[PDB]
Design a protein around this ligand. Structure first.
Ligand SMILES: [Mg+2]
Lengths: 66, 445, 608
């Protein structure tokens, strides 16, 4: 008896652990986890964690070339 | 697919409107130029003997080597309502469209042309210094407007409405600016007559009465016209769209006379070289092409350095590459521009090594990239590192009873084009919100 | 701007950069030169007439930014202008030649840059009158400018001889540069060391040009020469000593290497070891001939804090003897604290600093302006590669996909211990297992470099193969290298930060790396110099292989790309290896078991 609305993104183990980091540096946003290719996130903060994903790979590479 | 898009629009146009379009010799000549060599051969074979032929005679004449293109020609010929295939006396009597037939006959014989070649005034002026230069000026202004650099001479208001309403150069008024869509980078990548066809296709798509056959016929005689002469100012709708395309820079009009520039011939047909760009593992640009337009279109995705008379130089940066990717420009669009701007030395060396490796093996234990990938695959691995994800947001179910029901519901969603994701191992799939109600109704039934 | 030049609509991003205001001459076809008015960055066309003749003066007056296949990039600098006017090439002849080979009218900013690059050459000269720096001038005219400066303390005077190093910098800012051009033949007081060579040795033309660099006048011009690895730089230095023919010593901060240059020296030269001597950590016995050699090490001068009296007597003896010329090998480490004291201690009438790479972690390479002088000669890597004078090498980068568990532990790890944690991914073990299988199937000699000596021992012990690190007994080390070189059955070696240098191994042909310092461009290039001297370099079908196992999704991406960009600047791009063929075709993959991955993570956790 469980069928609840959520945003399911096909993902990777690495970006899954990045989403858990998002939870670490600001908690209780992302809701539950199914596997490495299925996580469930707050549908209000999908774009918040999308732009946080953007600054995450910005911190990962940062590609200066100046 | 340009002639294919024209033929598709003509087949969307209903049969009697098409037959109205087949009335006049200039329109029939333009359609005679559109049709394939086989269909052209069929109509010129038929036009001088008025005998309805069975299809079996055509089958006897046709050698089966060109049978596929024969079927394409007769399928377009039938679907354009230009053929009359009826199985009278059991066998398929074939007939060309008679209005098309008589108008082609009058065009070939020089008979009744009704000035569909053009309502002439024949008060010719020089076209090299007036018509070509005015056309180059106005087309330069709209080209830099489509680049994005500021320029004083903006386009007209109706073509500004074309860019606003159409998905081509989305004038995002929330930002207040015209913006480059992916469709419009495709527009930029298009050929010159391809761009003209796209402009008229959008303009005819949104224009309504402005009679449709007036638009059709007037455009076909506009393509049929020649250069540098004065002509009579025709219908009213044709006259006001004539003044409209005068504001487009296409005709030099002295407010009844008008002087059609080189662009009418450009619409009729097309026309270490220019645009041959030396690729570099150093990612430095030695273009064999210089124009203010060239610098204007290359600045969108290249850090540039300086301009010389043929070699404008610069450097590809990954910031410029990501700038292009954030502009909505496809990596396929960027690399497609790179094959349009390939260079002869690297092309010769790639052909020699292509023959050398195909002498050895087709596989070669490496991915396939014929152009030198040290410029290309560094960008293309970063372009593989451009999107590399996929996101589903909305309704999602799980843990089905049987795999057959899973495949049935998922396959049904794929058939109606509302399936976004599936996974056979997890027996889960995602569908769009628009398709939710239809999938639920199918699930109940 | 000597033009009206209404700007392009997109010339705003040409921020003082649209240089089309200056006209194109009709001689743009034959001439190759375009001139930057502000930056001075200089454009050279490779497929243009007389570019080969003009490129010599392009190196002489300008520095080369880059020399790719089609369009070379140069840049005028005051350093190379000083080198050109020290050779002797007057301003109006230089201006006439460059405008005669310039497609465009020359910018007066660059012209007056050349005019302001006019020095008092031949006007200040220090002479070492038997370990006594007498700073002469050619005229009393120099003295009136020089007395305006007051840092100090025909006409010479007292200077603190250590302070000569700093007042050389000081006279570089007040623009009266001293020159060091030894009149050894007019210095009859120092005993000459007349030693020749054999006719069987063959001097290559770039080495001949390098010998012509300090011998434009015959006086020994002191300076810098940097050449690629394995270019016979020892033989060039031996030739330079054999034409200088005076008392001379050789220095380098190592031991095994210093004794093998002693061997190489006394091999090809006609000088007997009677004139030679050696002073290092082990043995401290000198020759007593009036002229000869003490080939030695920085070790014996960099430490005087705790030395034996045997050491003390030898450093007293070599300080007492005044030498003529000195050789500074691997000069990229000398400008540190105890290391450039060798320049202050040793007084020789001519200097030369030598290294494989003139790059380091900072701009203490600019101290050579006031340490060892200008740069005399350099060779080109692509030129010697395509001429077969050095190797033609395929360079590859191997991205190891970072596994999930080591990734999440890497993210919860502290910053400087993150390095080992990303290195300990088992996917790296699997990939290098298949690669060593494929290249020993190819029969290649494979070399692994790691900064962590423990991680290098981990990889070597997992492979069941010998280990080479910084602090092992020497007899075990010579046993391993004897087995590898002499024994054909031993072929694969795991090297480290003492094995990248101090040994001479041209046999290396396939190189892999897994770890280094943050910005060790220089140490990375010293690692790559081992396979630069691969002597199988003239036959077709030869392509030496370089690999680098980098763990993905890390800032090791940034670190590796920042370190490897120096080699790209040398002209060595790295091909893509991300998905490879045969990852599954090898039947065994090292810690392919997820429980084995967990146990390896448990081991690195227990150490952590
Ligand atoms: Mg080497």
């Amino acid at each position: 008896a469980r069928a609840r609305k959520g945003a399911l993104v096909q993902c990777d183990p690495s970006i899954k652990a990045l989403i858990l980091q998002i939870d670490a540096k600001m908690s209780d946003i992302v809701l539950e986890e199914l596997d490495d290719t299925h996580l469930l996130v707050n549908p209000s903060k999908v774009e918040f964690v999308k732009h946080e994903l953007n600054r995450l790979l910005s911190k990962n590479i940062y590609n200066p070339m100046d | 697919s340009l002639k294919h898009s024209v033929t598709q629009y003509l087949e969307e146009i209903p049969q009697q409107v098409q037959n109205r379009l087949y009335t006049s010799p200039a329109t029939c000549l333009a359609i005679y130029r559109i049709l394939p060599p086989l269909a052209k051969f069929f109509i010129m074979a038929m036009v001088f003997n008025e005998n309805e032929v069975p299809l079996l005679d055509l089958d006897k004449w046709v050698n089966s080597n060109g049978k596929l293109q024969f079927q394409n020609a007769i399928k377009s010929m039938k679907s354009l309502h230009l053929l009359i295939p009826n199985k009278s006396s059991g066998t398929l009597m074939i007939n060309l469209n008679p209005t098309f037939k008589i108008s082609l006959r009058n065009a070939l014989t020089g008979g009744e042309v009704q000035n569909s070649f053009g309502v002439v005034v024949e008060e010719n002026v020089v076209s090299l210094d007036l018509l070509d230069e005015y056309s180059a000026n106005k087309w330069e202004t709209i080209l830099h407007f489509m680049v994005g650099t500021p320029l004083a001479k903006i386009p007209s208001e109706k073509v500004l409405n074309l860019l606003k309403h159409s998905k081509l150069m989305e004038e995002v008024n929330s930002t207040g600016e015209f913006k480059i869509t992916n469709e419009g980078f495709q527009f930029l990548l298009q050929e010159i007559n391809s761009q003209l066809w796209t402009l008229l296709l959008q303009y005819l798509k949104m224009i309504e009465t402005m009679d449709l056959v007036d638009v059709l016929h007037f455009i076909f005689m506009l393509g049929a016209l020649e250069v540098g002469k004065a002509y009579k100012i025709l219908s009213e709708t044709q006259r006001i769209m004539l003044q409209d395309m005068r504001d487009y820079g296409l005709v030099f009009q002295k407010h009844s006379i008008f002087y059609p520039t080189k662009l009418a011939l450009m619409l009729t047909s097309d026309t270490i070289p220019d645009g041959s760009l030396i690729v570099e593992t150093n990612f430095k640009i030695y273009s064999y092409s210089n124009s203010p337009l060239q610098i204007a279109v290359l600045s969108l995705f290249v850090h540039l350095k300086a301009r010389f008379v043929n070699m404008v130089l610069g450097q590809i940066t990954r910031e410029s590459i990501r700038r292009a990717l954030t502009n909505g420009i496809t990596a396929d669009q960027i690399i497609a521009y790179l094959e349009t701007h390939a260079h002869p030395q690297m092309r010769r060396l790639a052909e020699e090594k292509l023959e050398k490796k195909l002498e050895l093996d087709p596989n070669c234990k490496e991915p396939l990239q014929v152009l030198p990938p040290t410029v290309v695959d560094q960008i293309r691995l970063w372009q593989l590192e451009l999107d590399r994800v996929i996101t589903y947001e909305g309704s999602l179910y799980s843990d089905f009873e049987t795999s057959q029901e899973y495949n049935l519901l998922s396959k049904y969603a794929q058939d109606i084009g509302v399936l976004l994701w599936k996974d056979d191992k997890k027996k889960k799939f995602f569908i769009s919100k628009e398709g939710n109600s239809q999938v639920l109704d199918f699930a109940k039934r | 701007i000597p033009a009206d030049f209404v700007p392009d609509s997109v010339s705003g991003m040409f921020r003082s950069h649209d240089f089309s205001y200056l006209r194109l001459r009709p001689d743009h076809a034959s001439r190759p030169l375009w001139i930057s008015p502000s930056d001075g960055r200089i454009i050279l066309e490779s497929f243009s007439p007389l570019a080969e003749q003009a490129q010599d003066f392009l190196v002489t007056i300008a520095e080369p930014i880059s020399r790719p296949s089609h369009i070379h990039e140069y840049k005028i600098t005051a350093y190379s202008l000083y080198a050109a006017v020290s050779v002797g090439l007057e301003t109006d002849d230089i201006i006439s030649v460059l405008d005669r080979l310039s497609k465009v009218p020359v910018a007066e900013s660059i012209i007056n840059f050349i005019k302001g690059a006019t020095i008092s050459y031949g006007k200040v000269k220090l002479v070492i009158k038997h370990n006594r720096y007498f700073v002469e001038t050619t005229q009393a005219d120099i003295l009136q400018m020089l007395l305006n400066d007051s840092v100090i303390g025909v006409h010479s005077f007292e200077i603190a001889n250590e302070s000569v190093e700093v007042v050389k910098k000081r006279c570089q800012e007040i623009d009266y540069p001293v020159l060091e051009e030894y009149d050894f033949r007019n210095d009859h007081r120092n005993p000459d060391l007349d030693i020749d060579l054999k006719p069987s040795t063959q001097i290559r033309p770039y080495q001949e040009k390098s010998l012509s660099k300090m011998f434009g006048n015959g006086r020994a011009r002191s300076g810098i020469i940097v050449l690629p690895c394995g270019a016979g730089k020892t033989l060039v230095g031996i030739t330079a000593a054999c034409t200088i023919k005076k008392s001379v010593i050789v220095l380098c901060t190592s031991s095994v290497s210093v004794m093998q240059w002693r061997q190489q020296f006394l091999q090809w030269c006609t000088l007997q070891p009677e004139n030679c001597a050696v002073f290092t950590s082990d043995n401290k016995e000198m020759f007593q001939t009036e002229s000869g050699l003490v080939v030695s090490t920085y070790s014996m001068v960099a430490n005087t804090r705790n030395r034996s009296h045997d050491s003390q007597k030898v450093m007293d003896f070599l300080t007492g003897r005044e030498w003529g010329f000195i050789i500074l090998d691997e000069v990229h480490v000398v400008p540190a604290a105890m290391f450039r004291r060798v320049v202050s201690t040793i007084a020789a009438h001519a200097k030369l600093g030598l290294t494989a790479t003139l790059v380091r972690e900072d701009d203490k390479i600019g101290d050579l302006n006031f340490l060892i002088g200008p740069k005399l000669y350099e060779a080109n890597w692509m030129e010697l590669s395509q001429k077969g004078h050095i190797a033609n090498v395929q360079c590859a980068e191997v991205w190891c996909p970072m596994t999930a568990e080591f990734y999440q532990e890497y993210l919860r790890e502290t910053a400087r211990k993150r390095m080992l944690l990303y290195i300990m991914n088992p996917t790296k073990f699997q990939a290098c297992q298949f690669l060593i299988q494929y290249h020993e199937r190819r029969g290649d000699k494979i070399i692994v470099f790691s900064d962590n000596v423990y991680a290098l021992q981990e990889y070597a012990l997992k492979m069941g193969k010998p280990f080479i690190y910084g602090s092992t007994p020497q007899q075990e080390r010579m046993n391993i290298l004897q087995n590898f070189q002499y024994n054909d059955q031993i072929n694969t070696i795991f090297l480290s930060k003492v094995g990248d240098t101090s040994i001479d191994l041209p046999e290396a042909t396939c190189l892999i790396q897994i770890s280094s310092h943050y910005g060790s461009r220089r140490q990375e290039a010293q690692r790559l110099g081992r396979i630069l001297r691969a002597k199988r370099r003239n036959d077709e079908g030869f392509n030496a292989f370089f690999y680098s196992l980098v763990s993905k999704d890390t800032q090791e991406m940034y670190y590796s790309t920042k370190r490897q960009a120096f080699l790209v600047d040398q002209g060595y791009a790295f091909k893509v290896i991300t998905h490879l063929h045969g990852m599954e075709n090898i039947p065994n993959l090292a810690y392919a078991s997820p429980r084995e991955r967990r146990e390896l993570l448990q081991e690195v956790l227990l150490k952590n």
